Structures are given as structure tokens and as C-alpha cells.
Amino acid sequence: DDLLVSQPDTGEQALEITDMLVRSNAVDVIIVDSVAALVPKAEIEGEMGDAHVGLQARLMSQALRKITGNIKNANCLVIFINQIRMKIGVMFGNPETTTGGNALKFYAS
Amino acid sequence: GDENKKRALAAALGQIERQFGKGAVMRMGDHERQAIPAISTGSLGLDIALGIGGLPKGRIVEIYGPESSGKTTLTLSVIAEAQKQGATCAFVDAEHALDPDYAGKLGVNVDDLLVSQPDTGEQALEITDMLVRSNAVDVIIVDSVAALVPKAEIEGEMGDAHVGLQARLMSQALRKITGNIKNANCLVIFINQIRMKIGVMFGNPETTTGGNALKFYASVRLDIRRTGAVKEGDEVVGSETRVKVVKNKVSPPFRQAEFQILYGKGIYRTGEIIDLGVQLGLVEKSGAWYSYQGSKIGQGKANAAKYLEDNPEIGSVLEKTIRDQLLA
Amino acid sequence: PKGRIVEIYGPESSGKTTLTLSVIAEAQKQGATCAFVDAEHALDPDYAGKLGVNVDDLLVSQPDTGEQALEITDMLVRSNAVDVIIVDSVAALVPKAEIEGEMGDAHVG
Amino acid sequence: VRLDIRRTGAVKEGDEVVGSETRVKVVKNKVSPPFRQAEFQILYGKGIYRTGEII
DNA sequence: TTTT
DNA sequence: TTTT
DNA sequence: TTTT
DNA sequence: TTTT
Ligand SMILES: Nc1ncnc2c1ncn2[C@@H]1O[C@H](COP(=O)(O)OP(=O)(O)OP(O)(O)=S)[C@@H](O)[C@H]1O
Ligand SMILES: Nc1ncnc2c1ncn2[C@@H]1O[C@H](COP(=O)(O)OP(=O)(O)OP(O)(O)=S)[C@@H](O)[C@H]1O
């Protein structure tokens, strides 16, 4: 009961509401699940199988860029959830590889 | 003839001196320094790679590499050396991530330091410009350039197409600030992440962020790559750091150096000095058994490091000859 | 060719900067009076000296503003005493109007 | 007259790198036909690798 | 009179 | 004036 | 600015 | 972003 739910149909709306609430500074812990499940609206408007490779990364990087200062301001708790995708030519090093771009781990403390 | 040309040249130079002052002509003896003033990084491998034994003053330097490569804490060694020099330094971070306890473990005096938490990138730029011109600050550190965002994108919604905007403004910023940076001989570093761009299968797949003119203005660029880590027994205690010179104007490039980075303590100076001493012939080693001056100092890096830390004078004498025989 | 504008462009760090120095060395060989101005304010006199050019017989410039770079270039060219004139990093040149303006202000064109 | 400069490759002697191969292509001229691109090596410190091109 |  |  |  |  003492919890606010969200059912964001599009990832962009999830980002806008997260930004609005973090700045509200009223919320104290912020939880987003299944980052990989987030989809840019450009891919939604596109058909099935269209090549929109390397699109979610730029927008999520922009989102963290915008939100990190406010997150520091409010001392809020933000977690992220990623699945595992084994990428091509990964036989050297760790075969597992995270999703959701690359700058996420750079920003994540 | 020649006297007429000399007289005309002297007249023109005198007019320039009258209008602008001493800045027309370099001082024929004072403008000539045998050695360029610089700031050592605390690792002689990096310094000898730099070819001047320290980071050049008044010149932009940039570092890029894969995420979580210890570049952030790499800057802290430079901060500690600047504090050792007593130079006034300040730190600004765009990602707004900093652990003052972590830095204090690195030995840098966090108190003698100015922090910054710039909510917008434009304010980070304005404060950097204001401080550089103050000329009071001596080393300037900006982290996570990619994390910097134009205010236009902030005012815009999520997913709006503002492509090719940060580059123009950062180019303008460097354009404005480079002259002052030369004026104050201050130390400015930049931090970039790596983004693999489209259609890059030829050449190097990796590509830096933050536009393109950055590398043009930066007088020296270093690549940092995480190759391995050192594990003592079961637990992991430090990460092996590989840094390769990728651009320089004062030294030959591609002078890559190897060194270990130990958490908390910082740079594993004893290991690198031991390695270069034994490889150069200063430190004799009968095969795998480490020794010095015919004395069984110990076997293994830890024993020699312990033997060396208790006597800083011996280490200072050992390092003094290395730079002289290599740098100069 | 003499008395004619010549321009060089290319990707960053392509040795164009040191490419100019060979021209400087040849001009010095001719005994022609030459001067160098750099907008990016990056120059390694040790590096150039390694290139064989006599740095002593050379006039340096460190123009804080682009307008002053232009005024000094105009003054020297008309002096007619100088014979080869080198300006580096034209893009690094900035109008004083943009200097007086804040960060991110629209001074396009 | 306008010249384009492009970094194609670099010369490596043994392990270390010592110079960069420089490709310059003529892109505009009024006294000579354009597109007379030339190949030459640039060696750090020493400068232009004149012997190689003349050979 | 472009600009990334 | 790129960008993933 | 990757992606399976 | 695996695949038999
Ligand atoms: N407080 C700390 N305690 C223990 N180890 C630390 C601490 N801070 C950093 N490290 C270690 O130091 C190494 C690099 O971390 P830092 O230099 O502090 O940050 P950074 O990774 O360089 O910054 P990035 O890469 O841009 S996220 C890693 O091996 C970390 O585990
Ligand atoms: N002092 C130096 N020591 C060693 N190599 C140098 C030195 N200065 C320049 N180089 C090399 O010369 C080549 C081109 O560098 P420079 O001509 O000096 O500068 P530049 O790169 O032309 O100027 P830019 O491209 O506008 S940053 C590169 O291969 C550099 O590694």
C-alpha cells in the first residue's frame, strides 16, 4: 500500500516519470526493473525486424547524464536490472556480457 | 639593403611592443628552458613514457578507455603529487561520483581541494573558465566528459534528436580556454569513455566520445586498458593496469608502460621500479632469485617491496639514477 | 606558390602541424623571414628544433583572442618584412563576441 | 590551392613505432592539375623521409 | 553569413 | 558540428 | 552510439 | 544478441 506502482507502456514515459519523481525529492528509493525490456519509441514506430541497432544506448546514456546530478542532490537510491547477452567473438575474457549499452557501468558507483 | 630591412623589422617589432607589450617577441635567453617544467605522475614508467618525466604544464591532456578501468583513481595520484608540490588543485566531476574516503585512502589531502557538483554541464564549463583565469588554481580535473550534457538536451524531452550538439559547444569551450590555460601553465585533463561507432569494422573499432576537436587540441593523449588483475591467495586485491601512449607532441608515441594498481594504497611503485632496475641491469637477479648488490634481499615481489619500504633513502637513491640515465 | 593562399585540412593528429615545419625550415634555408602564430596555443620548440628548423630565427605568437591574431597577421603582412606566414588551427579561432557570451549561446554563423 | 592530408598507415621498426605514413592528395589547384596525390613517410624527430621517396 |  |  |  |  505504501508504494507507488508504474506500468509504463513506453520506455520514454518511464524515463520522464523517473526524472520527474527524482527531482520531486520526495521519493527516496527508486527501482527500475528490466532495463533491457525498455524500448525506444523509434523502434515501436518501426516495423518488426527493422535495423535500429545502437539506439537504446544513446538515449539511456543521455538519461543518466540528466538524472545523476539530481540523484546526488536527493541522496535517493536508484538500482538497475540487466539480463545477460553473450556477444559475438567473446571466447576470450568473460563470455557473458551485460545489456543496456556501456556507459551504465561507468556511471554506476 | 640588409640594414634597411633590419631597420624596418625593428620598427615593426617596436610598434608591436608599444601596442601590446613584451608578448611580441620571446625572451632570447629566458624563453629557452633546458627542461620543460612538468608534474610527475608518481610512476616512473609513465613519466619515461612521457619523455619529459611528468605531465606537461599548460597543455591539454586526455585519457580514454573502457569503463571501470581505474582512470578515476589514476587522476588521484596526480592530485597527490600536485598537493606534494603544494600546487592549488580542484576537482569537478560530471557524473557526480566521488568517494572522499576512497581518495583519502589514496593519501591525497581531500581538505586541501575544491569539490564541484555541477548539475548542468554549462555551469561546469563556466566555473572551469572562471577558475582557470583566476590563475590561482594549478591543476584542473574534469571527469566523465561524456556525462556532460548541453542544457538544450535537458530542456528537451526524452529521445529528442539533438545529435551533434555537445561537440560544437565543447569545441567552443576549448577554443576559449586554451589561451588562458597556456597563460597559467595549469594542468587540465579530460576523461572519455569508449563508444564503438557504426561501420567501424575497418581500422580500430573503438572510438572516443566528446566530439573530435578534443584530440586536436589535446597536446598528449593516453589510452588505458584493463588487461589483468593481481590475486593474492583467494581474494582479489588489485588490478593490473596497462596504459599505452597514443599521442604526444613532446615525446615519441606508443611508449606503452606496464604497472600494477593496488586498491586503497594506489600505485604499485615498488614493483615497477624493481622490474626496470632488474631489466636495465641495476638490480642483479640470479635467474628467479631476486637479489641486490650480491645480497639476498628476498624472493618474490612482496619481500623485496617490504625490504624497500622500510628504507626510503635506498629507494630514493635507486630511483634518482633511473630518471637521469633514461629521461635525460 | 608565392603570394597565394594555401589551405590544408585533414583528420586530427595527422602531422599537418609538423608538416608546416618543413616549409619553415626551407624558408629559413632561403633566409626568408617567417613567423608562426597558433590559435590552439600548442607548440613544442624542442620538437621543432629536432626537425632542424632554427627556432631562434622565428617570431612566435600566443594570441589570446582570434581578433588579435588577425590584427597582428594583417600588421605583419603589410610590413612586407615577413615572407612566410603560418596560422594553425583556424577552427580554434573564436570571435570575441562568443567570448563575451556565456556557454552554449547561439552565435552560429 | 588546397591539399587534403590523410593518415593511412604508420611504419613500425621491430616492436616500437617510429614514424607515420602520410598520404596527401591534391584537392584544388589553379596552376597544376588537381588530384595529383603523393605518398611519403614521415619519421618523428628527423621529419620527412626524403630518401625513401626519391628512391 | 553556417553548424555540429 | 556527429552518434549510438 | 552497439547487438544478438 | 547465441547455436546446434
Ligand atoms: N573505496 C575503495 N575501496 C576499495 N577499492 C577501491 C575503492 N575505490 C576504488 N577502488 C578500486 O580502485 C580501482 C579503480 O577504482 P577507482 O579508480 O576509484 O574508480 P574508477 O574505476 O577509476 O573510476 P571509473 O572507472 O571511471 S567508474 C578498482 O580496482 C576498484 O576496486
Ligand atoms: N617531440 C616529439 N617527439 C616525438 N615525436 C613527435 C614529437 N612531436 C611530434 N611527433 C610526431 O610527429 C607526428 C605528427 O606530430 P606533429 O607534426 O608534431 O604535430 P601534429 O600532429 O602535426 O599537429 P596536430 O595533428 O594538429 S595535433 C606524430 O607521429 C607525432 O608522434
XYZ file of C-alpha atoms (C1' of nucleotides) and ligand atoms in Angstrom:
679
model
C 0.000 0.000 0.000
C 2.771 2.451 0.918
C 4.239 2.193 -2.563
C 3.703 3.829 -5.949
C 3.341 1.444 -8.888
C 4.003 2.220 -12.532
C 3.097 0.447 -15.773
C 4.993 2.426 -18.416
C 3.793 1.423 -21.872
C 6.805 3.130 -23.468
C 10.324 3.434 -22.127
C 10.381 7.172 -22.762
C 7.472 7.644 -20.372
C 9.269 5.514 -17.785
C 12.243 7.843 -18.086
C 10.136 11.006 -17.898
C 8.293 9.840 -14.784
C 11.528 8.710 -13.134
C 13.077 12.114 -13.807
C 10.015 13.942 -12.510
C 9.897 11.904 -9.285
C 13.644 12.021 -8.549
C 13.560 15.852 -8.753
C 10.413 15.856 -6.553
C 12.991 14.781 -3.975
C 10.016 13.357 -2.087
C 10.766 9.817 -3.236
C 13.763 8.227 -1.526
C 14.343 4.836 -3.199
C 13.716 4.376 -6.922
C 13.508 0.943 -8.530
C 13.502 0.232 -12.257
C 13.365 -3.386 -13.400
C 14.228 -4.986 -16.735
C 16.229 -2.186 -18.329
C 16.642 -4.399 -21.388
C 12.852 -4.572 -21.632
C 12.895 -0.810 -22.173
C 12.429 0.078 -25.848
C 12.928 3.399 -27.672
C 9.766 4.812 -29.191
C 11.562 4.907 -32.541
C 11.657 1.112 -32.566
C 7.983 1.000 -31.553
C 7.024 3.151 -34.527
C 9.176 0.948 -36.736
C 8.024 -2.412 -38.022
C 9.285 -5.844 -36.961
C 12.928 -6.556 -37.724
C 13.959 -3.041 -38.752
C 17.602 -2.215 -38.051
C 17.642 0.259 -35.163
C 20.870 -1.072 -33.675
C 22.695 1.206 -31.257
C 19.707 3.375 -30.321
C 18.732 2.492 -26.750
C 22.302 3.074 -25.586
C 22.500 6.728 -26.616
C 19.183 7.627 -25.003
C 19.875 5.794 -21.759
C 23.279 7.480 -21.591
C 21.560 10.833 -22.050
C 19.054 9.896 -19.349
C 21.692 9.031 -16.761
C 23.578 12.174 -17.755
C 20.499 14.243 -16.962
C 19.490 12.420 -13.781
C 22.740 11.770 -11.909
C 23.016 15.319 -10.570
C 19.504 15.236 -9.147
C 20.164 11.764 -7.739
C 23.147 13.138 -5.851
C 21.038 16.104 -4.757
C 18.306 13.974 -3.180
C 20.569 11.130 -1.950
C 17.995 8.817 -3.497
C 18.530 5.110 -4.172
C 18.439 4.051 -7.820
C 19.032 0.448 -8.866
C 19.069 -1.005 -12.370
C 18.365 -4.534 -13.603
C 20.063 -6.117 -16.599
C 19.915 -9.501 -18.265
C 22.886 -11.296 -19.821
C 23.622 -11.498 -23.545
C 26.644 -13.448 -24.778
C 28.106 -11.343 -27.576
C 29.911 -12.415 -30.738
C 33.632 -13.139 -30.660
C 33.707 -13.285 -26.857
C 35.589 -16.585 -26.482
C 38.390 -14.627 -24.822
C 37.625 -12.988 -21.500
C 34.199 -13.478 -19.942
C 31.675 -14.836 -22.474
C 28.811 -13.192 -20.586
C 28.072 -9.560 -21.403
C 25.557 -7.143 -19.930
C 22.842 -5.338 -21.862
C 21.819 -1.690 -21.827
C 24.804 -0.104 -23.510
C 28.117 0.548 -21.817
C 28.061 3.919 -20.033
C 25.735 2.433 -17.404
C 28.580 0.656 -15.637
C 30.669 3.815 -15.947
C 28.042 5.856 -14.118
C 27.097 3.115 -11.649
C 29.148 3.559 -8.493
C 69.821 46.842 -48.214
C 70.028 44.377 -45.344
C 70.398 47.279 -42.916
C 67.219 48.796 -44.359
C 65.346 45.519 -43.856
C 66.660 45.187 -40.304
C 65.628 48.763 -39.519
C 62.136 48.182 -40.911
C 61.809 44.933 -38.957
C 62.935 46.668 -35.774
C 60.417 49.458 -36.368
C 57.581 46.970 -36.841
C 58.602 44.999 -33.754
C 58.825 48.216 -31.755
C 55.326 49.191 -32.837
C 54.052 45.761 -31.792
C 55.823 46.098 -28.437
C 54.308 49.557 -27.992
C 50.776 48.385 -28.729
C 50.890 45.014 -26.948
C 53.956 44.871 -24.701
C 56.531 42.123 -24.219
C 54.312 39.469 -25.837
C 55.568 40.284 -29.342
C 58.936 38.532 -29.001
C 60.203 35.659 -26.889
C 62.996 36.444 -24.448
C 66.159 35.372 -26.223
C 67.539 33.607 -23.151
C 64.655 33.471 -20.690
C 62.206 31.851 -23.129
C 64.686 28.971 -23.585
C 64.336 26.332 -20.869
C 66.670 23.337 -20.941
C 63.902 21.205 -19.402
C 60.145 21.686 -19.664
C 58.525 22.115 -16.228
C 56.137 19.251 -15.569
C 54.400 17.212 -12.876
C 55.380 13.591 -12.327
C 52.571 11.046 -12.078
C 54.193 9.042 -9.281
C 55.017 6.199 -11.688
C 58.381 6.425 -13.412
C 57.214 4.161 -16.230
C 54.544 6.666 -17.208
C 56.985 9.551 -16.766
C 59.623 7.984 -19.020
C 56.849 7.231 -21.498
C 56.030 10.947 -21.389
C 59.642 11.636 -22.342
C 59.808 14.658 -20.029
C 59.271 12.868 -16.729
C 55.961 14.491 -15.848
C 52.754 15.867 -17.248
C 53.444 19.000 -19.325
C 52.182 22.278 -17.920
C 49.656 24.476 -19.688
C 48.714 21.730 -22.158
C 45.513 19.729 -22.536
C 45.859 16.023 -21.764
C 43.143 13.427 -22.312
C 42.614 9.863 -21.106
C 40.121 7.366 -22.502
C 39.440 3.689 -22.004
C 36.870 1.051 -21.118
C 34.610 1.725 -18.164
C 35.805 0.960 -14.630
C 39.469 0.954 -15.630
C 40.679 2.905 -12.595
C 41.236 6.064 -14.629
C 39.274 7.928 -11.962
C 41.654 6.852 -9.205
C 44.527 7.267 -11.661
C 43.846 11.001 -11.566
C 44.132 10.945 -7.772
C 47.833 10.089 -7.901
C 48.350 13.235 -9.968
C 46.312 15.138 -7.389
C 48.500 13.800 -4.581
C 51.667 14.791 -6.416
C 50.270 18.280 -7.043
C 49.490 18.580 -3.339
C 53.044 17.436 -2.596
C 54.213 20.308 -4.776
C 51.774 22.480 -2.838
C 50.035 23.386 -6.093
C 46.438 24.512 -5.719
C 44.169 21.997 -7.444
C 40.425 21.433 -7.758
C 38.258 18.539 -8.926
C 34.979 18.666 -10.849
C 33.030 15.546 -11.791
C 30.197 15.479 -14.309
C 28.991 12.009 -13.313
C 28.891 13.248 -9.689
C 30.607 10.146 -8.303
C 33.384 10.569 -5.754
C 34.411 8.716 -2.600
C 36.401 11.081 -0.354
C 37.092 8.126 1.932
C 38.481 6.250 -1.078
C 40.646 9.205 -2.107
C 41.802 9.687 1.475
C 42.905 6.066 1.442
C 44.974 7.114 -1.587
C 46.834 9.639 0.576
C 45.582 12.792 -1.154
C 44.565 15.522 1.289
C 40.888 15.927 0.466
C 40.719 19.018 2.689
C 43.140 20.998 0.510
C 40.901 20.533 -2.508
C 37.878 22.253 -4.036
C 34.976 19.973 -4.950
C 32.274 20.657 -7.508
C 28.888 19.068 -8.202
C 27.780 20.740 -11.437
C 24.126 19.959 -12.095
C 24.460 21.180 -15.690
C 27.440 20.920 -17.999
C 27.253 24.606 -18.868
C 27.838 25.515 -15.231
C 30.784 23.114 -15.119
C 32.258 24.948 -18.089
C 31.610 28.401 -16.629
C 33.220 27.521 -13.299
C 36.192 25.887 -15.019
C 36.709 29.009 -17.122
C 36.402 31.288 -14.103
C 38.916 29.275 -12.056
C 41.481 28.797 -14.847
C 41.596 32.594 -15.385
C 41.856 33.080 -11.585
C 45.289 31.598 -12.275
C 45.247 30.647 -8.595
C 44.344 27.040 -9.363
C 47.205 24.990 -10.790
C 45.780 21.560 -11.708
C 42.242 21.226 -13.059
C 40.464 17.878 -13.271
C 37.218 17.199 -15.116
C 35.858 13.655 -15.122
C 33.316 11.959 -17.378
C 33.228 14.419 -20.263
C 30.636 12.187 -21.916
C 28.466 12.613 -18.824
C 28.353 16.325 -19.636
C 25.054 17.296 -21.274
C 24.043 20.509 -23.080
C 21.244 22.410 -21.390
C 19.316 22.242 -24.663
C 19.014 18.479 -24.260
C 17.981 18.940 -20.618
C 15.136 21.233 -21.642
C 14.166 18.732 -24.319
C 12.184 15.602 -23.577
C 13.440 12.009 -23.638
C 14.599 10.738 -27.015
C 14.557 14.053 -28.881
C 17.098 14.292 -31.695
C 19.799 16.713 -30.549
C 22.612 14.881 -32.321
C 25.812 16.830 -32.898
C 25.264 19.436 -30.175
C 27.733 18.696 -27.376
C 30.612 18.702 -29.856
C 30.152 22.286 -31.039
C 29.902 23.685 -27.519
C 32.867 21.748 -26.171
C 34.906 22.876 -29.175
C 33.923 26.461 -28.404
C 34.859 25.913 -24.760
C 38.348 24.628 -25.523
C 38.742 27.442 -28.044
C 38.017 29.965 -25.305
C 40.054 28.304 -22.557
C 43.265 27.140 -24.237
C 44.858 30.593 -24.237
C 44.261 31.055 -20.522
C 45.500 27.513 -19.891
C 48.764 28.390 -21.602
C 48.871 31.644 -19.642
C 48.628 29.961 -16.237
C 50.594 26.790 -17.132
C 47.749 24.919 -15.464
C 47.126 21.178 -15.782
C 43.874 20.168 -17.467
C 42.972 16.524 -18.040
C 39.875 15.103 -19.707
C 38.154 11.737 -19.294
C 36.333 9.924 -22.080
C 34.540 6.615 -22.379
C 34.583 4.385 -25.461
C 31.765 4.092 -27.996
C 32.096 1.699 -30.932
C 30.643 3.564 -33.899
C 28.778 2.242 -36.928
C 30.695 0.941 -39.930
C 33.966 0.763 -37.993
C 34.967 -2.794 -38.952
C 37.993 -1.311 -40.706
C 40.577 0.408 -38.545
C 40.104 0.453 -34.778
C 36.527 -0.476 -33.792
C 36.810 1.586 -30.608
C 36.048 5.294 -30.886
C 36.223 8.067 -28.314
C 33.336 10.288 -27.269
C 33.158 14.052 -26.865
C 33.393 15.158 -30.467
C 36.597 15.271 -32.464
C 38.384 18.599 -31.930
C 39.303 17.481 -28.403
C 42.119 15.269 -29.648
C 43.202 18.062 -31.985
C 43.591 20.479 -29.084
C 44.974 17.906 -26.642
C 48.760 18.004 -26.785
C 49.035 14.450 -25.416
C 46.608 11.522 -25.260
C 46.911 8.250 -23.350
C 44.946 5.023 -23.716
C 44.216 2.924 -20.630
C 43.230 -0.734 -20.918
C 42.374 -3.293 -18.247
C 44.333 -6.435 -19.121
C 44.505 -8.382 -15.870
C 44.349 -8.218 -12.086
C 46.570 -9.463 -9.273
C 45.028 -12.036 -6.935
C 46.681 -12.841 -3.606
C 45.549 -16.244 -2.406
C 41.780 -16.419 -2.838
C 40.653 -12.791 -2.616
C 41.424 -10.142 -5.234
C 43.361 -7.108 -4.031
C 44.468 -5.098 -7.081
C 44.067 -4.703 -10.817
C 46.864 -4.749 -13.373
C 46.672 -1.574 -15.454
C 48.063 -1.248 -18.974
C 48.456 2.279 -20.340
C 49.646 2.901 -23.893
C 50.691 6.299 -25.209
C 48.550 7.148 -28.220
C 49.502 10.767 -28.961
C 52.219 13.181 -27.886
C 53.941 16.307 -29.149
C 56.999 16.275 -26.867
C 57.807 12.550 -26.903
C 57.585 9.642 -29.341
C 54.189 7.947 -29.094
C 53.348 4.293 -28.460
C 55.637 4.135 -25.415
C 53.278 1.817 -23.569
C 54.031 1.036 -19.929
C 53.047 -1.774 -17.565
C 52.198 -1.266 -13.901
C 50.024 -2.674 -11.131
C 47.375 -0.668 -9.280
C 46.605 -1.766 -5.723
C 43.322 -0.686 -4.169
C 43.473 1.728 -1.261
C 47.244 2.082 -1.356
C 47.275 3.110 -5.014
C 50.228 2.798 -7.373
C 52.465 -0.269 -7.015
C 55.654 1.758 -7.325
C 57.995 -0.838 -5.829
C 57.098 -3.454 -8.433
C 57.734 -1.227 -11.439
C 60.966 0.200 -10.046
C 62.175 -3.337 -9.299
C 61.251 -4.537 -12.789
C 63.002 -1.694 -14.591
C 66.045 -1.942 -12.328
C 66.483 -5.655 -12.970
C 65.815 -5.330 -16.705
C 68.231 -2.407 -17.057
C 70.930 -4.218 -15.066
C 70.922 -2.030 -11.951
C 69.439 -4.879 -9.888
C 71.041 -8.295 -10.350
C 68.895 -11.439 -10.226
C 70.371 -14.947 -10.439
C 67.560 -16.359 -12.542
C 64.362 -16.331 -10.488
C 66.076 -15.483 -7.174
C 65.887 -11.733 -6.615
C 68.958 -10.049 -5.145
C 70.700 -6.688 -4.925
C 74.417 -5.896 -4.587
C 75.086 -9.587 -4.032
C 72.658 -9.626 -1.093
C 69.672 -11.966 -0.785
C 67.042 -9.271 -0.354
C 64.316 -11.860 -0.872
C 62.376 -13.983 -3.322
C 59.059 -12.665 -4.553
C 57.805 -9.138 -5.123
C 56.281 -8.773 -1.652
C 59.523 -9.477 0.217
C 61.524 -7.002 -1.867
C 58.779 -4.388 -1.532
C 58.823 -4.797 2.251
C 62.621 -4.588 2.238
C 62.372 -1.385 0.208
C 59.564 0.406 2.059
C 61.361 0.417 5.429
C 64.304 2.347 3.904
C 63.012 5.250 1.775
C 66.550 6.606 1.320
C 67.658 3.496 -0.583
C 64.602 3.696 -2.826
C 65.154 7.403 -3.444
C 68.783 6.804 -4.411
C 67.745 3.918 -6.659
C 65.090 5.965 -8.460
C 67.302 9.054 -8.799
C 69.718 7.334 -11.173
C 66.939 5.751 -13.248
C 65.407 9.011 -14.463
C 68.842 10.530 -15.069
C 70.035 7.578 -17.156
C 66.717 7.251 -19.011
C 64.872 10.579 -19.154
C 67.906 12.797 -19.774
C 53.327 29.494 -54.969
C 54.163 32.921 -53.602
C 51.546 35.499 -52.681
C 48.716 32.951 -52.813
C 46.574 31.480 -50.048
C 47.089 27.761 -49.452
C 45.000 25.627 -47.106
C 45.447 22.183 -45.565
C 42.757 20.118 -43.863
C 42.513 16.591 -42.546
C 41.719 14.384 -39.571
C 43.138 15.387 -36.214
C 46.702 14.423 -35.281
C 47.731 13.847 -38.891
C 51.112 15.565 -38.585
C 49.937 18.609 -40.529
C 51.367 20.743 -37.728
C 54.850 19.290 -38.159
C 54.266 19.263 -41.916
C 54.322 23.057 -41.782
C 57.702 22.934 -40.038
C 59.420 21.507 -43.115
C 58.194 24.546 -45.041
C 59.514 26.730 -42.227
C 62.919 25.048 -42.434
C 63.066 25.540 -46.191
C 62.117 29.209 -45.796
C 64.904 29.605 -43.247
C 67.265 27.913 -45.708
C 66.254 30.578 -48.207
C 66.843 33.095 -45.424
C 63.251 34.282 -45.773
C 61.820 35.957 -42.691
C 58.963 33.840 -41.347
C 56.722 33.874 -38.279
C 54.359 31.363 -36.681
C 51.044 32.015 -34.934
C 48.967 29.247 -33.372
C 45.356 29.640 -32.285
C 45.284 26.397 -30.294
C 48.435 27.615 -28.484
C 50.230 24.274 -28.802
C 53.869 24.240 -29.872
C 56.928 22.230 -28.852
C 60.073 24.239 -29.669
C 62.122 21.199 -28.674
C 60.104 19.146 -31.168
C 60.595 21.730 -33.918
C 64.289 22.003 -33.089
C 64.512 18.254 -33.562
C 63.081 18.981 -37.023
C 66.103 21.170 -37.796
C 64.257 24.490 -38.054
C 66.057 27.331 -36.281
C 63.500 28.315 -33.662
C 65.580 31.381 -32.766
C 65.136 32.969 -36.203
C 61.369 32.879 -35.827
C 58.661 35.062 -34.298
C 56.191 33.272 -32.028
C 52.678 34.387 -31.172
C 50.208 33.354 -28.470
C 47.023 35.199 -29.440
C 44.516 35.005 -26.598
C 41.725 36.181 -28.914
C 41.263 35.469 -32.596
C 40.745 39.144 -33.374
C 44.230 39.928 -32.092
C 45.630 37.093 -34.203
C 44.012 38.691 -37.235
C 45.226 42.194 -36.380
C 48.818 41.052 -35.887
C 48.736 38.981 -39.077
C 47.478 41.996 -41.018
C 50.095 44.276 -39.484
C 52.960 41.881 -40.274
C 51.853 41.023 -43.829
C 51.784 44.758 -44.704
C 55.203 45.174 -43.007
C 56.249 43.175 -46.067
C 59.286 42.221 -43.990
C 57.853 38.805 -43.156
C 57.927 36.339 -46.044
C 56.113 33.181 -44.871
C 53.113 33.416 -42.546
C 51.726 30.390 -40.719
C 48.425 30.241 -38.853
C 47.412 26.954 -37.245
C 44.033 25.692 -36.054
C 41.739 28.153 -37.806
C 38.803 26.366 -36.189
C 40.363 27.109 -32.803
C 39.936 30.797 -33.617
C 36.926 32.285 -31.816
C 35.144 35.627 -32.325
C 35.314 37.935 -29.333
C 31.515 38.091 -29.391
C 31.377 34.420 -28.432
C 33.994 35.016 -25.723
C 31.859 37.734 -24.158
C 28.857 35.433 -24.407
C 28.200 32.649 -21.939
C 28.480 28.903 -22.559
C 26.084 27.485 -25.129
C 24.757 30.777 -26.501
C 23.682 30.631 -30.143
C 26.259 32.590 -32.140
C 26.032 30.350 -35.197
C 27.354 31.775 -38.451
C 45.467 25.730 -53.828
C 44.098 23.219 -51.316
C 45.600 19.929 -50.147
C 43.997 17.053 -48.258
C 46.074 15.076 -45.759
C 45.002 11.620 -44.598
C 46.620 9.212 -42.148
C 46.607 5.806 -43.844
C 49.302 3.837 -42.040
C 52.466 4.001 -39.958
C 55.899 2.406 -40.202
C 56.879 0.093 -37.346
C 60.501 -0.982 -36.900
C 60.647 -4.171 -34.874
C 58.325 -3.750 -31.897
C 58.251 0.009 -31.306
C 56.643 2.520 -33.668
C 58.930 5.204 -35.072
C 57.070 7.033 -37.859
C 53.710 7.509 -39.519
C 52.961 7.039 -43.204
C 51.362 10.218 -44.543
C 49.101 10.342 -47.593
C 48.443 13.771 -49.099
C 46.076 14.219 -52.036
C 45.786 17.419 -54.048
C 42.189 18.612 -53.924
C 42.361 22.041 -55.587
C 44.884 23.992 -57.635
C 44.963 26.816 -60.154
C 48.479 26.289 -61.540
C 48.540 22.484 -61.752
C 46.092 19.662 -62.455
C 44.410 18.520 -59.239
C 44.202 15.040 -57.721
C 47.963 14.506 -58.044
C 48.125 12.576 -54.789
C 51.551 11.665 -53.424
C 52.819 9.030 -50.994
C 55.554 9.644 -48.436
C 56.679 8.578 -44.973
C 57.072 10.965 -42.037
C 59.616 9.980 -39.390
C 59.350 11.554 -35.953
C 62.120 13.897 -34.882
C 64.008 13.654 -38.158
C 60.990 14.686 -40.225
C 60.467 13.927 -43.905
C 61.655 10.545 -45.203
C 63.206 12.048 -48.320
C 65.460 9.108 -49.174
C 62.549 6.680 -49.432
C 60.503 8.797 -51.826
C 63.478 9.690 -54.014
C 64.429 6.003 -54.181
C 26.811 34.579 -43.166
C 26.505 28.345 -41.271
C 26.987 24.231 -37.520
C 27.758 20.316 -35.070
C 29.068 20.170 -35.835
C 28.293 13.738 -35.071
C 26.023 9.226 -32.680
C 24.969 5.105 -30.722
C 26.320 5.172 -30.028
C 26.288 -1.347 -30.253
C 23.815 -6.314 -30.917
C 22.269 -10.731 -30.772
C 22.354 -10.637 -29.240
C 23.552 -17.048 -29.346
C 23.622 -22.081 -31.773
C 23.399 -26.597 -32.991
N 36.974 2.722 -1.698
C 37.569 1.735 -2.371
N 37.853 0.588 -1.716
C 38.454 -0.402 -2.384
N 38.830 -0.441 -3.665
C 38.536 0.707 -4.287
C 37.924 1.816 -3.731
N 37.779 2.822 -4.674
C 38.296 2.304 -5.760
N 38.778 1.033 -5.599
C 39.404 0.201 -6.617
O 40.183 1.033 -7.454
C 40.121 0.558 -8.819
C 39.632 1.667 -9.713
O 38.639 2.411 -8.997
P 38.701 3.984 -8.924
O 39.958 4.465 -9.511
O 38.473 4.525 -7.511
O 37.481 4.494 -9.779
P 37.494 4.269 -11.332
O 37.048 2.899 -11.650
O 38.905 4.610 -11.816
O 36.513 5.310 -11.985
P 35.699 4.823 -13.210
O 36.491 3.661 -13.875
O 35.519 5.991 -14.219
S 33.953 4.175 -12.652
C 39.245 -0.692 -8.799
O 40.045 -1.867 -8.735
C 38.411 -0.507 -7.532
O 38.020 -1.752 -6.968
N 58.508 15.907 -29.734
C 58.154 14.842 -30.456
N 58.759 13.661 -30.204
C 58.412 12.593 -30.931
N 57.508 12.503 -31.909
C 56.926 13.687 -32.136
C 57.183 14.875 -31.475
N 56.391 15.897 -31.976
C 55.684 15.310 -32.911
N 55.959 13.978 -33.066
C 55.340 13.064 -34.017
O 55.098 13.768 -35.219
C 53.860 13.318 -35.816
C 52.943 14.495 -36.014
O 53.108 15.381 -34.901
P 53.339 16.924 -35.121
O 53.526 17.206 -36.550
O 54.474 17.486 -34.263
O 52.026 17.625 -34.605
P 50.688 17.410 -35.396
O 50.068 16.130 -35.006
O 51.030 17.528 -36.883
O 49.717 18.596 -35.045
P 48.211 18.251 -34.933
O 47.949 16.982 -35.795
O 47.358 19.438 -35.461
S 47.733 17.882 -33.085
C 53.318 12.221 -34.902
O 53.681 10.934 -35.390
C 53.986 12.526 -33.563
O 54.159 11.356 -32.776
